[PDB]
Design a protein around this ligand. Structure first.
Ligand code: MG
Ligand code: MG
Lengths: 362, 143
DNA sequence: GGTAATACGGTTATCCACAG
DNA sequence: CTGTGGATAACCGTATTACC
């Protein structure tokens, strides 16, 4: 079924950033599909067809399904996709036969859910072509969809996500077992690794946190965050709490072992980390519209708590790599303020890009 | 013009003005791709710069924009140029208006400059300011 | 603390026009 | 206040033996 309101104001549902919006809707439907599979009813196939339309099938779940505008993932109208497409087509095949219906121009049906062919098993497919009445560019970019499916696959483990493209006969298929561990591995597979992949999980006061992190020989840190499997593009309390525990527990380790107090970063030079927590509804606050920044003040300590604990223990794992990181840090401070001092004034060295004593040549 | 250092030249009425009179002003802007990186952070990749611009000086004057936060966005600035290419990677933070950073860069650095024609040459022992025609003519009669 | 003579390196300030 | 390119003009660190 289709919804007039989205047509009347598409940006409000999708944000027709065109065709960044066009891709926002595909996120919506496929996330809803995934969600519905997570509901127990274990694979989603996304297919970019050659005629330009998008099939998305799973193997009363039907309208339970097609009604998205639901960035869930968290394992007479209604439904924004059917409403935003010159043609949609819902085929269900459940119990020994296949029922089908299609909808045109905006959501108006055009056939009844009737039967056509008997199928020997079950599943449901939605295929749809968007329209260049509301959309500028209806080209489905294969690499973007591939990417989102990928990260979507790190996040939710009990599901697997395929993506084949009849336009240029290719197909990836994402399934990640190790999870958030494997995420940060993927963040640092282009780079040169240093430390192995760290990983702590947690649960406290209603929060379930899961944080993995590891070092490359790089400068800029890369830290991505999730409240309820949606991303925090601009971070907030949970992130700051994770960051409040790495510089806290390290300075502490610094004073004891590494002798030595240090800046905020310095310890995060080349640190990539993946942060995904689960906040309950009663503790979940954001900022001025858009879930881009977490506000929940309770998340700052509960993340800080969980991570700082685990990190204090697993800092007594080895000391080869611990003193070393605390050594690189003390290095970073020095290098950092060597810019501050040089700046205030307002050497023939031609220095290697990536700091790493182990491999560099002078 | 066709600069040996490539890039992009904006200002046809002024190319015309300069071929007409010898003098004109034109804009010259660097070549850039945007690069979507793993995670979700974008990264500007400069691949041609303006004629007679010092590359080192430039890269440096961009890191100088970073550490002075003259605009936010720039996470790292790194010259990746080598034997088979010219690549400057300006990597951005998560959540940072990439269009904003790019425009502020064109405005306030030498990522984009002006070229001013001023075409004087010695034509019969005296200097003359010349457009494309007395130049081409002069050539022809020489030949 | 100095210079001898054949070697190895590199560096600075000026003029001139014309741009922001 | 900086840089452009064809001109002007200088400048001084080091090694080596040897002797007050
Ligand atoms: Mg400029
Ligand atoms: Mg200039």
């Amino acid at each position: 079924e289709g919804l007039d309101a989205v047509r009347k104001r598409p940006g409000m549902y999708i944000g027709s950033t065109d065709g960044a919006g066009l891709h926002h809707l595909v996120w919506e439907i496929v996330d809803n599909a995934v969600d519905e599979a997570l509901s127990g009813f274990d694979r989603i196939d996304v297919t970019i067809n050659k005629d330009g339309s998008l099939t998305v099938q799973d193997h009363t779940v039907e309208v339970i399904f097609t009604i998205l505008h639901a960035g869930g993932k968290f394992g007479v109208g209604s439904s924004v996709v059917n409403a935003l497409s010159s043609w949609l087509e819902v085929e269900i095949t459940r119990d020994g036969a296949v029922y089908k219906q299609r909808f045109e121009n905006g959501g108006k049906p055009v056939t009844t859910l009737k039967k056509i062919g008997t199928a020997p098993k079950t599943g449901t497919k939605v295929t749809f072509m968007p329209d260049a009445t509301i959309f500028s560019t209806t080209d489905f970019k294969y690499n973007t969809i591939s990417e989102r499916l990928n990260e979507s696959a790190f996040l939710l483990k009990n599901v697997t996500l395929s993506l084949t493209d009849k336009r240029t006969d290719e197909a990836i298929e994402f399934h990640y077992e190790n999870g958030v561990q494997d995420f940060v591995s993927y963040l640092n597979e282009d780079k040169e690794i240093l430390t192995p992949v760290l990983y702590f999980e947690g649960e406290d006061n209603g929060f379930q946190v899961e944080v993995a992190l590891q070092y490359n020989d790089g400068f800029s840190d890369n830290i991505l965050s999730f409240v309820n499997n949606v991303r925090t593009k601009d971070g907030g309390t949970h992130e700051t709490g994770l960051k409040s525990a790495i510089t806290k527990v390290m300075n502490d380790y610094a004073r004891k072992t590494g002798l030595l107090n240090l800046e905020g970063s310095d310890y995060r030079e080349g640190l990539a980390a993946v942060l995904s927590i689960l906040v309950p509804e009663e503790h979940l606050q954001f900022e001025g519209q858009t879930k881009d920044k977490l506000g929940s003040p309770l998340a700052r300590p509960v993340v800080d708590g969980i991570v700082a604990d685990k990190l204090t223990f697993f800092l007594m794992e080895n000391g080869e790599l611990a003193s070393n990181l605390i050594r690189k840090a003390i290095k970073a401070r020095d290098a950092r303020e060597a810019a501050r001092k040089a700046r205030d004034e307002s050497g023939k060295l031609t220095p290697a890009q990536s700091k790493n004593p182990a491999k560099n040549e002078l | 013009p066709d600069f040996p250092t490539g890039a992009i030249i904006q200002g046809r009425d002024e190319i015309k003005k300069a071929y007409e009179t010898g003098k004109g002003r034109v804009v010259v802007r660097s070549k850039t791709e945007i690069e979507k990186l793993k995670g979700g952070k974008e990264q500007i990749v400069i691949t041609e710069i303006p004629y007679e611009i010092n590359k080192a000086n430039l890269v440096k004057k961009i890191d100088d924009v970073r550490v002075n936060n003259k605009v936010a966005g720039i996470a790292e600035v790194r010259d990746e140029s080598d034997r088979d290419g010219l690549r400057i990677a300006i990597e951005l933070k998560k959540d940072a208006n990439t269009e904003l950073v790019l425009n502020y860069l064109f405005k306030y650095t030498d990522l984009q400059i002006n070229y001013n024609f001023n075409m004087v040459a010695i034509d019969n022992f005296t200097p003359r300011q010349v457009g494309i025609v007395p130049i081409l003519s002069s050539y022809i009669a020489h030949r």
